[PDB]
Amino acid sequence: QARILEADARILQAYANILSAHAEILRAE
């Protein structure tokens, strides 16, 4: 069951990467 929690953590890390990429794209202009 711990694998589900690790997968959720990885999903949230991917979401954070998405948000950081969008922030950098917005700050580009």
Interface ranges with a copy of itself (CB under 8 A): 1, 3-27
Cβ of residue 18: shortest distance to a copy of itself, in angstroms? 5
DSSP 29: -
Cβ of residue 24: shortest distance to a copy of itself, in angstroms? 7
CA 28 distance to own-chain centroid = 19
Cβ of residue 14: shortest distance to a copy of itself, in angstroms? 4
CA 2 distance to own-chain centroid = 20
